[PDB]
Design a protein around this nucleic acid. Structure first.
Ligand SMILES: [Mg+2]
Ligand SMILES: [Mg+2]
Ligand SMILES: [Mg+2]
Ligand SMILES: [Mg+2]
Ligand SMILES: [Mg+2]
Ligand SMILES: [Mg+2]
Ligand SMILES: [Mg+2]
Ligand SMILES: [Mg+2]
Ligand SMILES: [Mg+2]
Ligand SMILES: [Mg+2]
Ligand SMILES: [Mg+2]
Ligand SMILES: [Mg+2]
Ligand SMILES: [Mg+2]
Ligand SMILES: [Mg+2]
Ligand SMILES: [Mg+2]
Ligand SMILES: [Mg+2]
Ligand SMILES: [Mg+2]
Ligand SMILES: [Mg+2]
Ligand SMILES: [Mg+2]
Ligand SMILES: [Mg+2]
Ligand SMILES: [Mg+2]
Ligand SMILES: [Mg+2]
Ligand SMILES: [Mg+2]
Lengths: 70, 117, 153
RNA sequence: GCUUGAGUCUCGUAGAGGGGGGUAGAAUUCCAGGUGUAGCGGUGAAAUGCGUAGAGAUCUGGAGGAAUACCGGUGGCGAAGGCGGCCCCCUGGACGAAGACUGACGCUCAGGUGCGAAAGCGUGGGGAGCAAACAGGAUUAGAUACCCUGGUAGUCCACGCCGUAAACGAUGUCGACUUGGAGGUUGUGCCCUUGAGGCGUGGCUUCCGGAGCUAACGCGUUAAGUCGACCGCCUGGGGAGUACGGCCGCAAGGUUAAAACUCAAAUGAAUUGACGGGGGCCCGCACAAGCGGUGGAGCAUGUGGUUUAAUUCGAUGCAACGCG
RNA sequence: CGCGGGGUGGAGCAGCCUGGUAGCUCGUCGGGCUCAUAACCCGAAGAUCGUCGGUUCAAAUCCGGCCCCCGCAACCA
RNA sequence: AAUAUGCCAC
């Protein structure tokens, strides 16, 4: 997440580009993940749960595409 | 007393406090300021405004070295990553490099057990 | 309420000067619905302050109000364990209402004789930042400055 | 005798499969030093704790241990437990294509033997981080807990022992048959690789669902469908997986496994409410914003209580008490 | 039996060693929040100091005994 | 952030 302010690059846009570079690297997500230790059982359980909810959401999405509401 | 012109600003923003340190390009610290030393205790010590105040105070404390431009290296996940750099540029140093140096172990040790509040 | 209020109630400008600001002042000073007494007291205070100073009654009243008007106050927010004294900027109508209310509180708590005398003296002190009203505004701004860390919300 | 079960060989394939050895970078910690000042660290707040003996921060150089970010994937392998940096040596299994070979050599399995997470035990090492025990601070009526600051065993290695887990897809192993769809992964064939395309065929794996089954929930070609072979296991709840006795163990304990009494239930799945310090969307002077009260004073009035011969009876959470 | 202490609201403790006056916590009472209780919040009262007798202008205090309660010692033969 | 309890047939 290292940036270089270039020629004729104002401070605000340099900071914005730095923000987006940090998010692209995802650093804060990893730090908030590593703040505590979560057991391998918890890791596996929550990974499975996230995958299950993603699958359910996408099936509900492209099923309700074939549904009229009003 | 010594003139350095080109400095490096390490921001260390944890979830509870922001430490801003201006050094030369050798790691020799020239000054520092902290959100807790800027008159903030507890609930307010870890807010972007507190980080802004601390960065401003550090900038003013490092004035006689005649620092013109700063590299910037940011560490930690705290709120003091944003307002601190804003306050540095508002103070007036030419910010030429902004880097995130947050420690990310490539595994590493075992983190503390998870809280149950 | 959970819906929304209609437009504010129409207020008839006071007869002597035709200022709805002074009408609101009279209403705020009024007690037990005795508007005649409130208007007489306000008018006596206004003429007395105009004579002691030199300014027109209306402009002198505006100066006294402006020296008391706040700009940011503190409201309570809940997160946990403690409360946030979040500083919020005030709208001008609330500014004038608060200034009038603080002036009237200070005037009532003053220790003179006739309430017209109390109000004239309090407004005169506000004309150079001395009254309990300007003290209250001082307290409000310094409390908001102390809590400024919570402003981002 | 036969080959279609079972197995061997030939060629390749994909993989955190296993054992041994080496190494890599990131990071925490510690040690030495340089710059550098009064805070740091922590919390819902706080304090214990660290710091002017110069902490925290930042830089340089070492030391050592543990785990391998990204790749990373209801992805892969393994009989299960489980296995994830990179490299090398030894090594097991699966799978595909074509052919040849052996010719029922098969399936299951009481007793037996082996493997078997974590914790734990023995000996010898190791010890960065984390952390039972422990101590202090806080919270609280208490708080021998959650939270905070430290911290030992232990997590790590070699060998030996334990042999238990919600050891779980709560679903024994093997075989055959019975509509589909969308994927994922790994081979293999055809053509046109004519744009990584389609067209098949194998293996494993994920979700939905059909007939059927099921008490229902649900399962549904990876069956809980239709059958066959063998084994294990159950017979109301509690007592009790306990006691006694065998066997195993160094111990913790594991395994096998009752009884007397006692109850008329215990239980599973769904249904309607109610409730939640569960979620979403709302509303009400519910809060918020204001104004004015009560609670203090004297009096009026009602009530409770005392009192009296009687202080008539009734109302007494909101929704009784200037009430009948 | 000797020696050192102790007797203070309902309970536990201070105060007292420097004679001019008795406090803390819990508890009790009254009200408040609650549907009600506990916790909690706000107010109040409570002991004239073991006891007798002295000293002193004044004794919880100083003194002498007396009463009860602890502690140490009660030995050598 | 703290937020314990509720035995009188129906
Ligand atoms: Mg922590
Ligand atoms: Mg057996
Ligand atoms: Mg172990
Ligand atoms: Mg032990
Ligand atoms: Mg050991
Ligand atoms: Mg050892
Ligand atoms: Mg250690
Ligand atoms: Mg403790
Ligand atoms: Mg701890
Ligand atoms: Mg078992
Ligand atoms: Mg398992
Ligand atoms: Mg499982
Ligand atoms: Mg089972
Ligand atoms: Mg078998
Ligand atoms: Mg498999
Ligand atoms: Mg299904
Ligand atoms: Mg069944
Ligand atoms: Mg047993
Ligand atoms: Mg036995
Ligand atoms: Mg209100
Ligand atoms: Mg009363
Ligand atoms: Mg009253
Ligand atoms: Mg009556």
């Amino acid at each position: 997440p290292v940036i270089k302010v270039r020629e004729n690059e104002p401070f605000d846009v340099a900071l914005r580009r730095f923000k987006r570079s940090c998010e692209k690297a995802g650093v804060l997500a990893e730090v908030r993940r590593r703040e505590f230790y979560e057991k391998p059982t918890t890791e596996r359980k929550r990974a499975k749960a996230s995958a299950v909810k993603r699958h359910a959401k996408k099936l509900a999405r492209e099923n309700a595409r074939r549904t009229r509401l009003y | 007393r010594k003139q350095v012109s080109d400095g490096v600003a390490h921001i260390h923003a944890s979830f509870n406090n922001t430490i801003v340190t201006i050094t030369d390009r050798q790691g020799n610290a020239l000054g520092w300021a902290t959100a807790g030393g800027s008159g903030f205790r507890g609930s307010r010590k870890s807010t972007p405004f507190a980080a802004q105040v601390a960065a401003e105070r550090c900038a003013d404390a490092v004035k006689e070295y005649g620092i013109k431009n700063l590299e910037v290296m940011v560490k930690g996940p705290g709120p003091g990553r944003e307002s601190t750099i804003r306050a540095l540029n508002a103070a007036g140093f030419r910010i030429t490099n902004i880097t995130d140096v947050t420690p990310i172990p490539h595994x590493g040790c075992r983190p503390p057990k998870k809280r149950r509040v | 309420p959970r819906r929304r209020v209609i437009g504010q109630r129409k207020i008839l400008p006071d007869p002597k000067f035709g200022s709805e600001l002074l009408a609101k002042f009279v209403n705020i000073l009024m007690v037990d619905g005795k508007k005649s007494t409130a208007e007489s007291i306000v008018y006596s205070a206004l003429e007395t302050l105009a004579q002691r100073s030199g300014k027109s009654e209306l402009e002198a009243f505006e100066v006294a109000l402006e020296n008391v008007r706040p700009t940011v106050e503190v409201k309570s927010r809940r997160v946990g364990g403690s409360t946030y004294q979040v500083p919020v900027e005030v709208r001008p109508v609330r500014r004038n209402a608060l200034a009038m209310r603080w002036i009237v509180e200070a005037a009532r708590k003053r220790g003179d004789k006739s309430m017209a005398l109390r109000l004239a003296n309090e407004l005169s002190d506000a004309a150079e930042n001395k009254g309990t009203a300007v003290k209250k505004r001082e307290d409000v701004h310094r409390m908001a400055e102390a809590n400024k860390a919570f402003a981002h919300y």
